[PDB]
Amino acid sequence: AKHVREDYLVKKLSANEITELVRGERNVPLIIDFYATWCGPCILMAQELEMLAVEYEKNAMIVKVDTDDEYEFARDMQVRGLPTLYFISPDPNKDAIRTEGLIPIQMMRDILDNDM
Amino acid sequence: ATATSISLGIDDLLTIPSKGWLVQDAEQQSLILEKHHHYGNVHAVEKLRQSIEIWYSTSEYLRQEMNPNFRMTDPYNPVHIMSFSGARGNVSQVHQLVGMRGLMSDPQGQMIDLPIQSNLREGLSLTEYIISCYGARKGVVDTAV
């Protein structure tokens, strides 16, 4: 509460909140992270996303979804593997991007800079 | 002592060749007796009186076979020269690096059932190392007393 800074910047949102975010008007690129606690390589993805959320202070919004909580929603989004990231353009004309696997952070920067 | 020079490596700590069989056979009789002890063939005292006696006899047999092994196969082993010449290192002290450290004692007298069947070259396990700490404390509550 403004006295001690939050340790983690990425905020966990439900399925309905993500639907509202994607449907509603946006002005910055959106990042959707699919992860689970039992996941092996997802710790490294969480660390890399936490690092990325600091460089892009207010120019991007980063959120995560737990497939153990919202399984059907994750299945509907065409997710066929846990380390999955979704890049959503701030405009409705441009289509979204799905990335699978433990991608490097630099390619993530290239994705949301030169393609979003 | 310089021109010739001496040093202590890892392969100069020469465990006697027959330790591979003696420790294996000592484990077999400890497995069989502890298996018959659950069958009622022997009572608790007999199990206690034997687990102390195999590892004491085996450890004291390796110790007495150390020098005959050293003095015939590797007369110039650095550990042998250091101790056999009387410079530094007991026969018992060399037995700790080469041989067995088994049968440490509980502080209130009495031996411990678990035997330390490993060298300091091979490396003690977690339980064996903790057992060796019992004799470590009563080595500094003695130099201060």
Binding site: - | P17, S18, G20, N69, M72, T73, D74
Partner: protein
């Protein structure tokens, strides 16, 4: 006696190591006399596709004034650092037994008994990290 050394053969070779080592070293030195220094010091000098025999060396010495000392120096000029460092094992006062510096990787791996079961990549760090 069979396929693998027994616990008595090993404890006897432990007593008589130096005799076999001396025989190996004597054979290696005796090879130098017949072969000659030129060809003997060519196994470690790769990338010199010459003759390396004291039959055409005399022919070269008849063609040009270089004797069986400048051809050797000329070959020992494309040695590369690693090959020279390995060749240094034939030093007159280091005396590495020929069997040791020619054992295959498989034989050397049997000294400690193959790769560790627990991977070493878990221990290795990088000396320039925070």
């Amino acid at each position: 006696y069979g396929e693998q050394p027994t616990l008595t053969e090993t404890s006897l070779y432990r007593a008589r190591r130096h005799l076999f080592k001396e025989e190996r070293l004597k054979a290696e030195q005796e090879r130098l006399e017949k072969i000659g220094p030129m060809a003997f010091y060519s196994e470690w000098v790769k990338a010199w596709k010459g003759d390396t025999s004291r039959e055409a060396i005399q022919k070269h010495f008849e063609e040009t004034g270089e004797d069986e000392n400048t051809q050797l120096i000329e070959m020992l000029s494309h040695q590369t650092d690693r090959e020279y460092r390995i060749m240094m094992g034939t030093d007159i006062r280091i005396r590495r037994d020929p069997l040791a510096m020619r054992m295959r990787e498989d034989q050397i791996k049997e000294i400690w008994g193959g790769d560790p079961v627990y991977p070493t990549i878990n221990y290795i760090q990088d000396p320039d990290i925070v």
